[PDB]
Design an enzyme around this catalytic site. Structure first.
Site, PDB file in Angstrom:
ATOM      1  CG  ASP A 107     100.541  -5.082 -82.596  1.00 55.69           C
ATOM      2  OD1 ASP A 107     101.468  -4.254 -82.716  1.00 55.69           O
ATOM      3  OD2 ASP A 107      99.879  -5.468 -83.588  1.00 55.69           O
ATOM      4  CE  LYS A 115      96.471  -6.486 -84.255  1.00 58.04           C
ATOM      5  NZ  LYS A 115      97.710  -7.229 -83.849  1.00 58.04           N
ATOM      6  CE  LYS A 143      98.636  -5.379 -87.063  1.00 54.58           C
ATOM      7  NZ  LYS A 143      99.880  -5.886 -86.391  1.00 54.58           N
TER       8      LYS A 143
END
Lengths: 217, 217
Positions: B92, B156, B185
Site C-alpha cells: 500500500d 485506497k 479500499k
C-alpha cells in the site's frame, strides 16, 4: 542573538504531505533570504532543493523513515544514502520507537548504527528524532544514550506528527544526557522568537522550524 | 454478511509508531483468529509478521513511503521490493499528493508507475492511498485516473494521519471512477460493524481496519 546569527540555528522546514513544488520553492526562497543553516524536506524534494540552493551556503537536509520510524533499517539506509548522493548534507532519522518501548535495546542500537555508519561513510552527519511525546522520561534518557553509543551526531525532539513537540524540560534532559558530545535539535511547535530563544537556553544547538519568517522578522 | 465473510474484507492493521513486538504479535494472533485477508504493518515488521502468519491463509502486507507519500520514488521501490522479498504479498503506497495538487500529473504518474512495475514484477499487487482528506473531489477523481493509468490494482482512501479518513461519498466516487477495473479500499476511522458494512455498500472491496476486534465481536 542577532537575527542573522539566530538564523544559523535554523533548519527551515516544510514536511507537509500536500506541499507543492511552489511551496518548496518558497521554502528555499525564505531560507536563502534569511541565510538559515538548512532547508529540511522529505526525500522526494532533495534534487529540487539542491538545485534551488546551488551556490549558496544553505544546506539541503532530508528526513528518512519519517515520521514513523518503523521502516526496515536497510530501506532507511538506502533512502538516506540516495538522498545524500542527490544533495542532502544531513539526515534526520526517526528512532525505532516500538523497539525502544519494547526494551529491545540491541535492535534500537543496530538500527541507528546502520544509519550512522552509512551517513558517516559519505562524510555527512545524522540526527536521531526521539519523538519525546511517545516516551517516558527514562526512555528519553536511554534513547539519547543509545544514539550516542551508535554514533549519532544529534538527538532531536520531535517529528511534528505526534501529540506534542519540543518541550523545554525535555530539551534540558537531552542536553544533560549527551553533554556537549552531541548536538541537540528542538523541533515541533516553535512559533515565536521568544520560544526559539527559550529552546536555545534549554540547551538546543539547532532547531527545526516552519514559522521561520515570523521568528526572524 | 457473516463475521467470517466480513473478516475476508479486512486488512487488519497496526501502523502506530510506538507499536511493540508484542503489539505486532497480538495483531497477528487476532488476524489468525478471525481469518482476515491480511495483516498490514510498517516495513520493519514484515519478517516478523511473515513468520507469525506462516502456514496460514492470512497475507502479510506492507505500507511504503507512508504516511506522507513524499519519499523519493527510487527509495520507495527499494522499500517495496525489500518488503515483498521478506514476505509482503501486497504493497500500500501513498500518492505524491503535493505533485497532484501542483498539477504535475506526469510526476504523479511516474511515481506510481515505478512502484507498479516493481510490485508487478514480483507478482504482487499495489494499492495507492489518495489521502482524500487533502484532496478536492475533482482531485480524488483525477488521482484515481492517474492511479489506473500507472497500473495500480487498488485505490485506497486514507492513511489515518490526516484530518479525516474513509467517507462513504468518497468511496462511492472512487468506485464510480475506477469501475470494476481496480479495487477500492476504505481505510481510516472505521470503528464499528455498521460503518464497515456502509463502506462495503458504498463500493469498498477491501477495508483497512485497526479496531477489528470490536467490529468482529
Amino acid at each position: 542573538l542577532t537575527t542573522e546569527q539566530l538564523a544559523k540555528y535554523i533548519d527551515h522546514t516544510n514536511l507537509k504531505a500536500d506541499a507543492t513544488e511552489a511551496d518548496i520553492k518558497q521554502l528555499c526562497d525564505e531560507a536563502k533570504k534569511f541565510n538559515t543553516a538548512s532547508v529540511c524536506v522529505n526525500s522526494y524534494w532533495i534534487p529540487f532543493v539542491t538545485e534551488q540552493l546551488k551556490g549558496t551556503d544553505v544546506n539541503p537536509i532530508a528526513v528518512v523513515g519519517f515520521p514513523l520510524g518503523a521502516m526496515a533499517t536497510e530501506s532507511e539506509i538506502f533512502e538516506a544514502t540516495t538522498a545524500i548522493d542527490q544533495g542532502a548534507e544531513e539526515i534526520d532519522m526517526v528512532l525505532n520507537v516500538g523497539e525502544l518501548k519494547g526494551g529491545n535495546d540491541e535492535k534500537v542500537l543496530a538500527d541507528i548504527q546502520g544509519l550512522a555508519d552509512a551517513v558517516h561513510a559519505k562524510g555527512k552527519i545524522l540526527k536521531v528524532i526521539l519523538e519525546n511525546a511517545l516516551l517516558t522520561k527514562d526512555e528519553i534518557v536511554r534513547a539519547c544514550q543509545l544514539s550516542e553509543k551508535a554514533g549519532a551526531d544529534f538527538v532531536k525532539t520531535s517529528t511534528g506528527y505526534s501529540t506534542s513537540g519540543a518541550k523545554v524540560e525535555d530539551v534540558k534532559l537531552m542536553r544533560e544526557t549527551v553533554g556537549d558530545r552531541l548536538g541537540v535539535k528542538a523541533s515541533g511547535g516553535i512559533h515565536s522568537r521568544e520560544e526559539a530563544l527559550a529552546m536555545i537556553d534549554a540547551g538546543a544547538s539547532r532547531m527545526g522550524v516552519s514559522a521561520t519568517v515570523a521568528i526572524l522578522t
